[PDB]
Amino acid sequence: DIAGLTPCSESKAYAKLEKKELKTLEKRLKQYEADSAPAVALKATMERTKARFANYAKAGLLCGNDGLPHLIADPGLALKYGHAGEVFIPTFGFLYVAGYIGYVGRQYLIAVKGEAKPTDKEIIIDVPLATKLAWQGAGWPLAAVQELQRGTLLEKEENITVSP
């Protein structure tokens, strides 16, 4: 109960919709023998389903008027009420991987311009070079903020313009 909401372990339309889905799976399950793999598959679907509802209520996800897990994307309402795993943890779990791919792709382009013809090595990726920058870019925020302090991250007004 943060913004008119309720815990999904406490709401009833959530549990009503769980019983709605398991009803649809079981009336689909009835057409098969109890040994048959079209019934082994559906009972494995249920145990993935029933554990999914158990795990969403375990994490304390917020339901509402429709009985669905609602997310809270604000720190200070997720840090305070124990919901940083909804948005506030994957907003840095993403931005680690995002700037990682950016930094590896940056370092591959920076370390290819001092060559004979760098356009050839954007077709033919230097795999012993590219994987070497791939592994060693794992501390990229530790390397970027040191490059941020110099002035070597931002190229100056050598950049190309039209008519300022």
Binding site: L61, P69, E86, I124, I125, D126, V127
Partner: protein, 41 residues
């Protein structure tokens, strides 16, 4: 076969190997971790 490894190191071939890597990694994780809507512990 050095010329054959250049072909394996072109742009679309590394793209179709790395995308089978990255999808195939996320497929195996989403098998052994069924339905991660929220970061649990």
């Amino acid at each position: 076969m050095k010329d054959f490894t250049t072909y394996l190191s072109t742009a679309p071939v590394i793209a179709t190997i790395w995308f089978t890597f990255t999808a195939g990694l996320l497929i195996e994780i989403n098998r052994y971790f069924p339905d991660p809507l929220v970061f649990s512990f």
